[PDB]
Amino acid sequence: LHFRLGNLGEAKKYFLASLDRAKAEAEHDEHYYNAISVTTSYNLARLYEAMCEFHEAEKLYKNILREHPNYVDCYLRLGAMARDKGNFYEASDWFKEALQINQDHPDAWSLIGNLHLAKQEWGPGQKKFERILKQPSTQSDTYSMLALGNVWLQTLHQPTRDREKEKRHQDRALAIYKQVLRNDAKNLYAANGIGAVLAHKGYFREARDVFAQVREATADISDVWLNLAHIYVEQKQYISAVQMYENCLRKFYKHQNTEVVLYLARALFKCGKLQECKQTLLKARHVAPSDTVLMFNVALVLQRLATSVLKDEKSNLKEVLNAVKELELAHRYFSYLSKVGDKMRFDLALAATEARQCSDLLSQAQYHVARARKQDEEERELRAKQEQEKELL
Amino acid sequence: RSFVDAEVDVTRDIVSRERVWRTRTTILQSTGKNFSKNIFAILQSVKAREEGR
């Protein structure tokens, strides 16, 4: 219960005290207190996972498997820890053993499914969810129905130039979300799924209202915040979107999530926070420099800031010198991306198109270095006049 | 495994005494708000558009 309350210290103390006392009470019914010790060991292992004492988490799961090896939850947590290590291979190895122990276990299929979905293996991922609904023990699993809906929706995020493939998937996803919401009126994901397909269908007006109505029940679904923030960007209420992305980053991510940071950068660009847009993308490049889409966005912000500095002759020398080198760096980055860019993440014509605009503005930028020097001298005359006039008094 | 399979009943014993309220089905359910009536009212509007009315 303390774990459920987030009282990791108390949970640790109480589970440890429970195990130490359990050795004393096991004297009455060793089998029963051994079962209790399994529950206490699992609860403590799950806490150590949350507390990052992974050697003790690993050892406790292994202890349960040493004493009670059919406890599927140990295999799944060992795999989930591998997933947290980012080791989809090791994670799948542990989840596969869980399926080899109980082929109809829905979380084992789902965990491997998460590995397939993260890897864009929509077909193989789909296999995991389809296998669950046909079995009587899981024939009513809304999670799997919604998972098929999510598979179709995830395919909707990838660009197929023939809209019918996407639209065929749209109707597949929507039929699932419509029925699931009919069967379970508290279903958060069916409602959001309807909103998601309406949004893909372009019905942002209703989709926003739906995402808002889903948000009224819970503050812990980031996608609802993200969908609302995206529509706020599309509806040009950029301040609200920026505020959602900033607080979303502070609440849900223990690190700067580049997806949210990019959504924030897109809003900040339009929000006029060009300084923060620049800083946010520089932070993003500092976090994921091999991601060429973020690198492009950095070059784009440098280009857009320089465009403003270069248009108005009131801009000073430090601003112009920064704009020249920053714009040279941006052109250099687009030129670099044209040679080292990751072709699978962005449209190749985009980098070549922006590179030209940067080179053009850099050519015009050299004049401003000479222009800026006079503006500094212009005030000195008034100051000299002020000095002699002060001597007059 | 002939020696391990004999304890699946023990794992069932543990699981029979163990209780968790948040599951893959209940994790998908709201704390108290029912969405059906509003979203179906929205679908009343959307269904007409999907049928081209």
Binding site: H157, D223, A265, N297, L350 | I27
Partner: peptide, 27 residues
């Protein structure tokens, strides 16, 4: 005229599955 270039971000309307609830077990 070339349609105004926005920040390069692939639009995703998501409905992400929640993490599987492996919460500590009551006895």
């Amino acid at each position: 005229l070339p349609e105004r270039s926005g920040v390069v971000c692939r639009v995703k309307y998501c409905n992400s599955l929640p993490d599987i609830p492996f919460d500590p077990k009551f006895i």
